RNA sequence: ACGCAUAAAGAUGAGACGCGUUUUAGAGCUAGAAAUAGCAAGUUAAAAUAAGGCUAGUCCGUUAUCAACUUGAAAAAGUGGCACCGAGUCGGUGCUU
DNA sequence: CGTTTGTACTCCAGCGTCTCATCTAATTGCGT
DNA sequence: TGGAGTACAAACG
């Protein structure tokens, strides 16, 4: 018999309906096999799929990048504790020890409490000389005697540790912040060189530059309020480049400097300003005002007292929050009394107390405590330092997060150097500790891996270990830095195995020309006049025209060749460029030229041929770029057999175009079928697009295929699949390919199965103008009437009685059975949630190490169960101990499934249960269902909690009025259709006392929820008064007592209802448990009750 | 002015920064039998950031895939009759296994 | 008297900013 | 979101 079927993509649904040629749907007695005394179970062959969406993986790289930096972050500390070893041992030979022995608690610890000196005196002493780590890196910096190696050790490994961002390049000059004022310089500089005298305007300080947050419309504004400039230089237009990246970056000046570009005064700009240095200060000054906007931002020292700016600034912000803290001790304690015991006291509250020990931020301390320093009197200064927020800060807090690393070098150069002569292992190991500070791993090296990595593409010049000090030495940049782009781009289309040209390659622009200038036709253009023409105006003329020159060749004699030219302007040597034999030299250059940026593997590549080219044009066009891929490779258009490229400069019937020449004639088609060649599992990822659709479409397959299996094996007609979008083109390739394998007299493929795909206007108003009217709040049926009606429709338009099949229509929809399966899962991701919480008595902490019992360290919490497993066993009950019989159900974590898998019996063992019975574990994954009396359902959803399993089937004629109310206004669209849809609603009204009725039974049969079921009725009888929109619109909400999963709160007009949490896995021990296959039609039960 | 480099959505990978938690170290004092009472103080550091693994690397550990049962180490293959009259989570009648 | 267990009721969970590279695919400024 | 954890009072031996 002749079938369809339907289908309905989603992102957590799939529904599958099966027609025949009569619209209405067969029905199939199937077997059910087990240990139960069923043999049968008739059912409809509708359904849906449910299932969980997929996800992105960025939060997984997000957290395997932080394991690595905490990877490294210990061994550079390891390594500068090296360096001190050989000397530590002469100070304190366990001075390291200690500082691993520093968390656990005083009864593990092998040496004393004290990690410094290790005797309480020495201890109390250093925390009174140096109340922060700040007065001793500044007393380092600021001295000239010896310090004791623990503190030199101490300092270093501070800065080593933390320090700061990598983002700014070059050198910065630490006194530059104090020159911000450097404004009226950069205007005199500027008044000397354009010596028409600019204005020198000086009626706005640089501190209205300096403290606004300068945006480039600030910048702009205040820069043009200033100095209305009388040229550009003196304004906006050169101060961006100045102060900022270039928006203009081409013609950045016009008078000077070549009229040439900068970009963002990068390290490159010191030959970048090659231009300005050929034809010239203007430009000098931004660089100091540079350090100086950034300095004098970030410092709040004038660094001519001392070297260590940083050092000093910390100093004072710790100076003012005591000198404030006492003051406002003794103001809140005279004026309020009753307060002082409050803040000063709690640790909860947002008060003082409650913002050093509790949890408190800066934001919510500061909101807390300003209307006691505002009626209060005499706290205008208090008042006027927390309007800036700069009142009661501490050091290490959230904004430090700007401070470039030069400081930090800066601050280190003098540590060394002023303490080296007392020791000499210092003086010649300056250079490698600076190199630990400073070494970095450029970001296309990638992962140091030796071959077991998924993600590495690093290659060795050697087989030895890397260090900071020999990377070079090991690791060949030249090849990791090719192999970083050879790796991402993509391979040709029609040889799937070699690389694409690029875009500018020369061969790729002959091939280009020759295939545009063969259609030139009137007859067509021969080769003789292929090369009289491409010689005269494609090698000359920069820009030639479509249409004219060609003309006026001709009338002489009775679409760009760019890289051609931009390399003629570049190296002058007229026939060094036009020689073949050359041409594999300067096609390296060309791939040179747009595989690299770094302008340092440029000098590494080009440098063979610095004999071949005189120094000029070799530094000119080490300067040039190019970039793109293109879409063709080498072998598919020349060197494979007269090549393709030979035929397209030949001259005859030869000038026939690349698609046709390469398609028609079969020397040249042998290519596309001697390497034509891809499974599913790979094919998807050629799909665009999140993973939310791939899952939907790997699922669709499926359950095509098993549909496929049950109906006898015969091929389907017709498919209708449903979401100018390339997505539903692919599925229907996808399809197709899988369905239509058979071939022809001429061995190609026999369409045996047709595809189609539709659009939802048509399916919506087909809705509308049959009133099929659709409301998602009630039960989940609406994904396979939905599937139903794409099969209806698809095939009664690619076919083409309205009065006579929408009875089978209407029952159809009404029909009470539809085979809703919810996909069970094994569960995947981390252990546990995140929050160390402190230390409790209670037993559930989960260790977080091997060797740290949570009862004295604290630890995680809540850990998530990976599936459940049924165990019957004998256990020890009572003082008498008695081998009780118990039939039990456990739950398996994923911290725990590892060992599970591996050994069974000793995890068991290991919970206690003795004397397991092997055969009788049962592994129960999350949504496993049970079916207990009455057809009532429960789905586990964990160890110890269940959720609903059944729905609520509503007649038709119920959800047919509820649409008609649960929308009033928005809905009538019409008048004419509205009077009469006024007039029909408003003649009964007691449907709201049979939706009332029938939750009410329902949930007596199977919800048993019967308090809430007492609110919601007594709730209703009170509010029955008013108006049916008002009723419905709360009506609608009603029905989340009854709906599928996990059980949620929702609210009556004024009443809000708890939602009631199901506990009681005991009583599932003895249900029928139900094992359904994916589309539920083939089904196994097995009945606890016969075990144990 | 039709044109395409464009911004503005994503997908994937690599390189660095700033915080935040947890446990110790920073000798609280006085009057009282104690409970309690009065006052003083507060800003920093070390160690860990999924338990761990063997391939021992400056490497790997949260994405994707997964009813039953027979065979197969596994991948993988294979295993469940039809017509008719009716509907409250699917029934019944008939034929043939 | 002592224990287990059943219901109703809270309170809760790691986060923000940089640089670089490739691809797809639908969009618009105003190129002239 | 929806699941683990704390604190509370009644049925059963």
């Given at each position: 018999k002749k079938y369809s079927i339907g289908l309905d993509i989603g992102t957590n649904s799939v529904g599958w309906a099966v027609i025949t040629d009569e619209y209405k749907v067969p029905s199939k007695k199937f077997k059910v096999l087990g240990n139960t005394d069923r043999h049968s179970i008739k059912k409809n062959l509708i359904g849906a799929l449910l299932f969980d969406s997929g996800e992105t993986a960025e939060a997984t790289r997000l957290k395997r990048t932080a394991r690595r930096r905490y990877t490294r972050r210990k061994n550079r500390i390891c390594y500068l504790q090296e360096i001190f070893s050989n000397e530590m041992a002469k100070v304190d030979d366990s001075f390291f020890h200690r500082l691993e022995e520093s968390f656990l608690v005083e009864e593990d610890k092998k040496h004393e409490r004290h990690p410094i000196f290790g005797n309480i005196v020495d201890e109390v002493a250093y925390h009174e000389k140096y109340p922060t780590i700040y007065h001793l890196r500044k007393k380092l910096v600021d001295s000239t005697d010896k310090a004791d190696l623990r503190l030199i050790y101490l300092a270093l490994a501070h800065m080593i540790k933390f320090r700061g961002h990598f983002l700014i390049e070059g050198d910065l000059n630490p006194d530059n912040s104090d020159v911000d004022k450097l404004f009226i310089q950069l205007v005199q500089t500027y008044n000397q060189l354009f010596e028409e005298n600019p204005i020198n305007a000086s009626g706005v300080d640089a501190k209205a530059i300096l403290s606004a947050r300068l945006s480039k419309s600030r910048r702009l504004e205040n820069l043009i309020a200033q100095l209305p400039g009388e040229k550009k230089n003196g304004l906006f237009g050169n101060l961006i480049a100045l102060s900022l990246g270039?928006?203009?970056?081409?013609?950045?000046?016009?008078?000077?400097?070549?009229?040439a570009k900068l970009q963002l005064?990068?390290?490159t700009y010191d030959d970048d300003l090659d231009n300005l240095l050929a034809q010239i200060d203007l430009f000098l000054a931004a660089k100091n005002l540079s350090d100086a906007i950034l300095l004098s931002d970030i410092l709040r020292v004038n660094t001519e007292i001392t070297k260590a700016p940083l050092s000093a600034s910390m100093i004072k912000r710790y100076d003012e929050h005591h000198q404030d803290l006492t003051l406002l001790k003794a103001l809140v304690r005279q004026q309020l009394p009753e307060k002082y015991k409050e803040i000063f006291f709690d640790q909860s509250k947002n008060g003082y107390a409650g913002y050093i020990d509790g949890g408190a931020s800066q934001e919510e301390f500061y909101k807390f405590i300003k209307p006691i320093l505002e009626?209060?009197?005499?706290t205008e200064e208090l008042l006027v330092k927390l309007n800036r927020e700069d009142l009661l800060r501490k050091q290490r807090t959230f904004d430090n997060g700007s401070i470039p690393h030069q400081i930090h070098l800066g601050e280190l150069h003098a540590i060394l150097r002023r303490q080296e002569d007392f020791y000499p292992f210092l003086k010649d190991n300056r250079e490698k500790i600076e190199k630990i500070l400073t070494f970095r791993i450029p970001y296309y090296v990638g992962p140091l891996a030796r071959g077991n990595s998924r993600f590495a593409w690093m290659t060795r010049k050697s087989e030895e270990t890397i260090t900071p000090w020999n990377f070079e030495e090991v690791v060949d940049k030249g090849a990791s830095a090719q192999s970083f782009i050879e790796r991402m781009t993509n391979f040709d289309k029609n040889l799937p195995n070699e690389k694409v040209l690029p875009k500018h390659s020369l061969l790729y622009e002959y091939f280009t020309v020759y295939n545009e200038l063969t259609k030139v036709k009137y007859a067509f253009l021969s080769g003789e006049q292929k090369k009289a023409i491409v010689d005269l105006l494609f090698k000359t003329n920069r820009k030639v025209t479509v249409k004219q020159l060609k003309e006026d060749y001709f009338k002489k004699i009775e679409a760009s060749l760019g890289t051609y030219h931009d390399l003629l302007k570049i190296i002058k040597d007229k026939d060094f460029l036009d020689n073949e034999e050359n041409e594999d030299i300067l096609e390296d250059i060309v791939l040179t030229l747009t595989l690299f940026e770094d302008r340092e593997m440029i000098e590494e590549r080009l440098k063979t041929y610095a004999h071949l080219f005189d120094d000029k044009v070799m530094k000119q066009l080490k300067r040039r770029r190019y970039t793109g891929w293109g879409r063709l490779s080498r072998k598919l258009i020349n060197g494979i057999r007269k090549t393709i490229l030979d035929f397209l400069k030949?001259?005859?019937?030869?000038?026939?175009n690349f698609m046709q020449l390469i398609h028609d004639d079969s020397l040249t088609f042998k290519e596309d079928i001697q390497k034509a060649q891809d499974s599913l599992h790979e094919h998807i990822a050629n799909l665009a697009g999140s993973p939310a659709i791939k899952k939907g479409i790997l699922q669709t397959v499926k359950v095509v295929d098993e549909l496929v299996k049950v109906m006898g094996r015969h091929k389907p007609e017709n498919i209708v699949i449903e979401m100018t979008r390339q997505i539903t083109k692919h599925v229907a390739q996808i399809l197709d390919s899988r369905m239509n394998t058979k071939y022809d007299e001429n061995d190609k493929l026999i369409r045996e199965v047709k595809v189609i795909t539709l659009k939802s206007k048509l399916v919506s108003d087909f809705r509308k103008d049959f009133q099929f009217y659709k409301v998602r709040e009630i039960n989940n049926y609406h994904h396979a009437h939905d599937a139903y009606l794409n099969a209806v429709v698809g095939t009664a338009l690619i076919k083409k009685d309205k009065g006579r099949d929408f009875a089978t229509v209407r029952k159809v929809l009404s029909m009470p059975q539809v085979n809703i399966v919810k996909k069970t899962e094994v569960q995947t991701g981390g252990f546990s949630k995140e929050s160390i919480l402190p230390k409790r008595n209670s037993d559930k902490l989960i260790a977080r190490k091997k060797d740290w019992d949570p009862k004295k360290y604290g630890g995680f919490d809540s850990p998530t169960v990976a599936y459940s497993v049924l165990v019957v066993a004998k256990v020890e009950k009572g003082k008498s101990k008695k081998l009780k019989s118990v039939k039990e159900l456990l739950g398996i974590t994923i911290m725990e499934r590892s060992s599970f898998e591996k050994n069974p019996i000793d995890f068991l063992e290991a919970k206690g249960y003795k004397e397991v019975k092997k055969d009788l574990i049962i592994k129960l994954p999350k949504y496993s269902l049970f079916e207990l009396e009455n057809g009532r359902k429960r789905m586990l959803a964990s160890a110890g909690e269940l959720q609903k399993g059944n729905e609520l089937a509503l007649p038709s004629k119920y959800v047919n009025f509820l649409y008609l109310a649960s929308h009033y206004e928005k809905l009538k669209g019409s008048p004419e259709d509205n009077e009469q849809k006024q007039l029909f609603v408003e003649q009964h009204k007691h449907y709201l006392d049979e939706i009332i009725e029938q939750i009410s039974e329902f949930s007596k049969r199977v919800i048993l929820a019967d308090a809430n079921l007492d609110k919601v009725l007594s709730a209703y009888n009170k509010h029955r008064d008013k108006p049916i929109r008002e009723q419905a619109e709360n009506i609608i909400h009603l029905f989340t007592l009854t709906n599928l999963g996990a059980p949620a709160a929702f609210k009556y007009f004024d009443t809000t209802i708890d939602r009631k949490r199901y506990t009681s896995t005991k009583e599932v021990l003895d249900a029928t448990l139900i094992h359904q296959s994916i589309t539920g039609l083939y089904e196994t039960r097995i009945d606890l009750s016969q075990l144990g």
């Open positions: 270039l928006t203009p970056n081409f013609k950045s000046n016009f008078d000077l400097a070549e009229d005064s990068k390290d009626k209060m009197d005499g030949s001259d005859g019937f030869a000038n026939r």
